Amino acid sequence: LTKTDYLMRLRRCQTIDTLERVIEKNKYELSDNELAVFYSAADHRLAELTMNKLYDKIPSSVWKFIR
Amino acid sequence: EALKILNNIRTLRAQARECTLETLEEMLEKLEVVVNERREEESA
């Protein structure tokens, strides 16, 4: 699957805290093969949520604010 | 083990054909920030 699909599914989660719970659960559901793009989706979602500004592409300096 | 082959430009340039620039860039931008954090620690 594409990371965009997961991005839209994860974009429904807010507060950041809620996202940490879904990724924690899906972590034990994924077969590791889709986890590759899932990581990008989670990272992407966290970046836009942390900067409080949605962007298609995420600037390199934004990854520094990811915990 | 998973870093030794990454230190060689020969293998690095070879395995870099496994994915397109798309994924390579998204992960690259994630690595440079990590190194910076380590820099801050080594500087402190």
Added chain:
Amino acid sequence: EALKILNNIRTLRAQARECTLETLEEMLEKLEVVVNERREEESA
């Protein structure tokens, strides 16, 4: 296998704990020129 954990900053931080700053900087430079090569071809 190695490029899998490299796509996430969290996992990357853990593996970067077994490498000195020098190695991290050295590998970053090596990866940089590799991505640059791909970028060159991608734009050319």
